Amino acid sequence: IGLRGLGRKIALIHKKYG
Structure with missing residues (x-):
């Protein structure tokens, strides 16, 4: 539906951020 958040x-x- 979009990104995996x-x-x-x-x-x-x-x-990178997680």
Whole structure:
């Protein structure tokens, strides 16, 4: 529906802010 918010599946980018 949009973004994973915390970078869930996007966990490689997750470390940017989460």
